[PDB]
């Protein structure tokens, strides 16, 4: 369900980070970092719900 | 480098979440949520560094 969709976004983000590791800079990294934090907040809400 | 190692942990976490979506419960989910937050904090530090 919604967790299946979130696992997809997390697999997409791991791929962003694999690419980022060959083309790094602060902006993109702190960008992906905040993407993970948003997904973690959604997961937390599903845990509470 | 260290970013290559982190991309590996993120691909591992996406796999945890894919499995979790068929066997969910609050503990494990809030567990994985805090795992993402720790990885995001490491990424942020690399961005700053």
Numbering used by the authors:
A (entry chain A), B (entry chain A): 1 to 49
What do the authors of the reporting publication say about this deposited model?
Here, we describe the design, characterization, and application of de novo helical hairpins that heterodimerize to form 4-helix bundles in cells. Starting from a rationally designed homodimer, we construct a library of helical hairpins and identify complementary pairs using bimolecular fluorescence complementation in E. coli. We characterize some of the pairs using biophysics and X-ray crystallography to confirm heterodimeric 4-helix bundles. Finally, we demonstrate the function of an exemplar pair in regulating transcription in both E. coli and mammalian cells.
As a starting scaffold, we aimed to design a helical hairpin that homodimerized to form a 4HB. This was achieved by adapting the sequence of a previously rationally designed antiparallel homotetramer, apCC-Tet,36 and linking two helices to make a hairpin using a loop taken from a natural structure in the RSCB Protein Data Bank (PDB). The resulting peptide was called CC-HP1.0. CC-HP1.0 was soluble in aqueous buffer, and circular dichroism (CD) spectroscopy showed that it formed a stable helical assembly without an accessible thermal unfolding transition. By analytical ultracentrifugation (AUC), CC-HP1.0 formed a monodisperse dimer. However, surprisingly, the hairpins were in an anti-arrangement rather than syn. Nonetheless, the backbone of the computationally designed syn model and the experimental structure of the CC-HP1.0 dimer are similar: they both have wide and narrow helical interfaces;36 moreover, the positions of the hydrophobic-core residues overlay very well. Thus, it is possible that, due to the expected similarities of their hydrophobic cores, the syn and anti forms lie close on the free-energy landscape of these assemblies, and that under the conditions used we have crystallized out the latter. To explore this through modeling, we generated AlphaFold259−61 models using the CC-HP1.0 sequence. These predicted dimers of hairpins with the syn arrangement, i.e., as designed but in contrast to the anti-arrangement observed in the crystal structure.
